[PDB]
């Protein structure tokens, strides 16, 4: 029941990443991909709790 808006660079390797996305550092967020011809396993699902 907590939301954390922390869109910073994830440090995976031992090399620090301060503002630069290196080989060992990746953004935690990745985008969606929606097409009308997609199947059941790729269709959007609007979820409310």
């Amino acid at each position, epitope marked *: 029941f907590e939301r954390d808006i922390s*869109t*910073e*660079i994830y440090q995976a390797g031992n090399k620090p990443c*301060n*503002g*630069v*996305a*290196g*080989f060992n550092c990746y*953004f935690p*967020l*990745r*985008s969606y*991909s929606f097409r009308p011809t997609y199947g059941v396993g790729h269709q959007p699902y609007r979820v409310v709790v």
Partner: antibody
Amino acid sequence: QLVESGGGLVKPGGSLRLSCAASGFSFITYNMNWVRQAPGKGLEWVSSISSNILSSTSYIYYADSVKGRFTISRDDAANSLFLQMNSLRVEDTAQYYCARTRSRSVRNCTSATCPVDAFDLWGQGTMVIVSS
Amino acid sequence: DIVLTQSPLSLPVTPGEPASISCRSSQSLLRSNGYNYLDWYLQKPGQSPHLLIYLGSNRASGVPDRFSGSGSGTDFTLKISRVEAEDVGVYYCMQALQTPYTFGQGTNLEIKR
């Protein structure tokens, strides 16, 4: 960037409507910018924008002339970046590249100067002419 | 503003011979962080520029291993192991600071047939 609109003959006292379009891409979480180029060798960065998801949008970087006469806005709903101006003193030939920065995270950035990583999404298709 | 001129002419490059282009920055870099902050670009005329080397000494955007930047401080340079017909285009070194972003002059590196 795949296709962009805008272009034609505009009087120096007129205004231009610049818009760059693209395909399915992370438009929201990337920082875009406008760069114009001379017919000879050499580009010239003319505008830039921030991203609302990372932080607030009150970190826009401007030069003197483009603060005086230019502005940049984003729709925040689709894949479209908008550049607007009102006054044209000396602007004959330019390309208005709809590039973007390779920085999905914003750190140690103020409203004056902070580094950017790289540009890899240059776009072409906007030609400007002034002659009537 | 940093004064920055690369080579405001056409530099002949013979095939099979390495070519190097150098630029110097009036202001010291690396003030924001320990990593070097300068990007290398290649702009072939007609369609679109292509990115080769980003900040530091690394590789990205599918750059061939022939391109390799080097140098630090007020001494910057490139190195291409083998030039090709697709290597024709203007080059720029661009530091990631100085928000009034002034640009340098491109260098033509056409193959000397």
